[PDB]
Amino acid sequence: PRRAPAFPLSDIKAQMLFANNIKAQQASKRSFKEGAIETYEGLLSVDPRFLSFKNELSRYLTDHFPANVDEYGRVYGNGVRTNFFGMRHMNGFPMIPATWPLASNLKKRADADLADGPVSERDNLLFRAAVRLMFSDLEPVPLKIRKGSSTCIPYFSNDMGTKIEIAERALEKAEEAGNLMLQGKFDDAYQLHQMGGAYYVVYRAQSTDAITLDPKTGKFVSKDRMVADFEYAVTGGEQGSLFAASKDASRLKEQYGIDVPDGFFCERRRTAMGGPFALNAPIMAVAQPVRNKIYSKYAYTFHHTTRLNKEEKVKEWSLCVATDVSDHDTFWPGWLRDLICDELLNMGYAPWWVKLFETSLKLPVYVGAPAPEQGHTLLGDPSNPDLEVGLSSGQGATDLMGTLLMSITYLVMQLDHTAPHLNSRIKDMPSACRFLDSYWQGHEEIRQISKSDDAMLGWTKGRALVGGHRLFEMLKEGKVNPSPYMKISYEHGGAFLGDILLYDSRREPGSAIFVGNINSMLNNQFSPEYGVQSGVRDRSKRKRPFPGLAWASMKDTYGACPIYSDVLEAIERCWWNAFGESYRAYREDMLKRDTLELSRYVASMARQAGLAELTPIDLEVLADPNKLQYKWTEADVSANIHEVLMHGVSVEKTERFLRSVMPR
Ligand SMILES: [Mn+2]
């Protein structure tokens, strides 16, 4: 077990991060957040007539529109793969209590029996190769940072200039400080450079849940959310328990007294964590160029834009295999850290910085108020941290890790069960070089698309495919997973970033095609996550700028879903059945007001010039900036609002900085 030390919230270390101000001390002292999101301004999540609108919506429509994914998990028909009832929650009120994150799933990795290192030593070499290349050619470019992004841990300053001082001083003595950590002087850099420190628990909120109608009596059973307690946590999955949080709304018919219409539970309380940036500066400064690298040197498996972007790569394929990933974060191996740091150093990457990683990569955490009468438990010991808490959200390069080991285990498994004889062209580390290059160049029969956990796969004429069918079959059975690092199933109802690949009768990659999910659109409408906090002059702080945009963008967006317009029918209809009015004109006017609001926000798009400057994708990024923090990469935005969203960082300081960090 070995508890990760449970220091009281009160601690000087707890202070050193925070600016010891308003939001700082408050966040230290923060109570459990709760509150209906103003799901539309002038419209919370709680309106009962709108709740009946959900009622008609998910009921009458799922009724009319049952899912069309086949046995293989490959998709046909309407292309629905999902209950519409995932709307049906307190989508402003979280399902409570909450999990307590572990410190070591290593035994949990020994339960899923996830491997402690290489399968074959060849595989080791493979690891070393992906590492070899992700740690290879570099063309540094100026770093950039979100405007209005709170410094979070440490100080929680909203000021950009804070982030400036932090990141720049980090550019100045990350060497000295990472050395201090190598010297073990964690708190010295942590209290002078204020580098590193801790994570702060926050929430992702699953907007939906797998509500399941009961034919025999109409029960609406959302998927249960098994979660750890503090003991299951500190005793790395050892003691403690795994358990659903209460889904009930009557507990707010209790507490809030709020009326409880059918099927309306409460959104899942997934938990991200914030953390110090000064080390994330080197992270973006390289990875973002590395992002650009693989997107340039390769893309292919890597480029992510239009469904077209992907589809074109796909229908090509004789065979295609959407992936399905178990708890994507927690499962990341620490021996993987071992090889990371290994070949970092082997390839001259800066040992102090390497120490900086391992610091962050096992950085101490903190729990706020997971339930009322819970948390405010400081965790870990920033003097000898040892956490194996899995992929903490504070890193942005975690995506690199996911995309990594996933692509690994994918391709590997393809060797394992489709192309072992072909491993013969993988004679060594250099062979792994030409190869991996070529595979991310795609000049291979076995194939993939990848983005963190989400991924797919591909195959062709040439002497390897039938085993692809086989491995396909086994995984489709899922009866045993060959993967010793992950529980990777096929996703029945598989998709890639909401690109729901469709199949026809032939069920082929060349058959039917991706669609932008329309149910997902419904989510965008009604089951997203955040409110805006309208009580601020600038929307830059606001979680969710301009929803009306998505309205207009809808065909341009998820009109990729064939049945699109019928969805329009249903929405407008059900709204006339709801508030008895024009959600049409409603949302139109919301769009108009979006243009109004943005109008003063924007200059070069002179007055209300029109929205022609913004890509429909960037339009998606403007109704939805938020996924840019966990979907869109930064460069994607057109430079205008890109800068409205982001601010530049000096190329030079970062340059020489990398020159230090890089083996030159
Ligand atoms: Mn998808």
Residue numbers in the entry: 1 to 664
What does the published report state?
Localized reconstruction provided the in situ structure of the P2 polymerase to sub-nanometer resolution. This opens up new possibilities for studying RNA replication and transcription in the context of the assembled double-stranded RNA virus capsids.
The method allows symmetry-mismatched and/or flexible subunits to be treated as isolated single particles separate from the rest of the complex, facilitating their classification, refinement and reconstruction. To demonstrate how localized reconstruction can be used to address symmetry-mismatched components, we focused on the RNA-dependent RNA polymerase of bacteriophage φ6.
